[PDB]
């Protein structure tokens, strides 16, 4: 149930007043999905763990494709999830449970709020989408840095 996928890349060529050559780069891939447990009180979150496994792989691959690198060339990784208002924080936990240690963060939010994705070699990258996550959604992110 993926409504939107978004990929953000950032290249830094000058930092602390110093020319960074080659530029250092960060990428983050984000998916907006329907939370099957929105509006509900459930204990068995298997369905979100299985969905998270596939998303991590999908978003991790989008990151490396965006940076045009092989996965072994990545310096840092991280992942986060923001649950919409009719979900629970445990839903974000579940979605982040499977392995892609890699830092992760979970938050509750609303459309347009910024999610900070940690980067463990914490540093980080901010992501947002103007219209996500809606109350019945989850916004999941995977980030990778290069160089």
Numbering used by the authors: 3 to 102, 116 to 136, 146 to 171
Could you share sentences copied from the article?
The SPO0826 gene of the marine α-proteobacterium Silicibacter pomeroyi encodes a protein with a molecular weight of 20.5 kDa (residues 1–­193) and a calculated isoelectric point of 6.2. The crystal structure of SPO0826 was determined to 2.1 Å resolution using the MAD method. No electron density was observed for residues from the expression and purification tag, SeMet1–Thr2, Gly103–Ala115, Lys137–His145 or Gly172–Arg193. SPO0826 also forms a single domain composed of seven β-strands (β1–β7; residues 4–17, 20–36, 78–85, 119–123, 130–134, 147–151 and 161–170), but with only two α-helices (H1 and H3; residues 48–69 and 91–97) and one 310-helix (H2; residues 73–75). The dis­ordered residues in the SPO0826 structure correspond to a large C-­terminal region of BB2672 that encompasses helix H4 (residues 97–109), most of the H4–β4 loop (residues 110–115), the β5–β6 loop (residues 137–145), including the 310-helix H5, and the C-terminal region (residues 172–193) after β7, including 310-helix H6. However, this interface was not observed in the SPO0826 structure, which crystallized with a single molecule in the asymmetric unit. In BB2672, the N-terminal interface is involved in the formation of the hexamer, while in SPO0826, it is only involved in crystal contacts. The observation that SPO0826 crystallizes as a monomer in high salt and acidic pH (2 M NaCl pH 6.5), while demonstrating the same hexameric oligomerization state in solution as BB2672 under alkaline and low-salt conditions (150 mM NaCl pH 8.0), lends further support to the hypothesis that pH or salt concentration might be a key factor in oligomerization.
To extend the structural coverage of proteins of unknown function, we targeted Pfam protein family PF06684 (domain of unknown function 1185; DUF1185) and determined the crystal structures of two representative members. The biological unit of both proteins is a hexamer and analysis of homologs indicates that the oligomer interface residues are highly conserved.
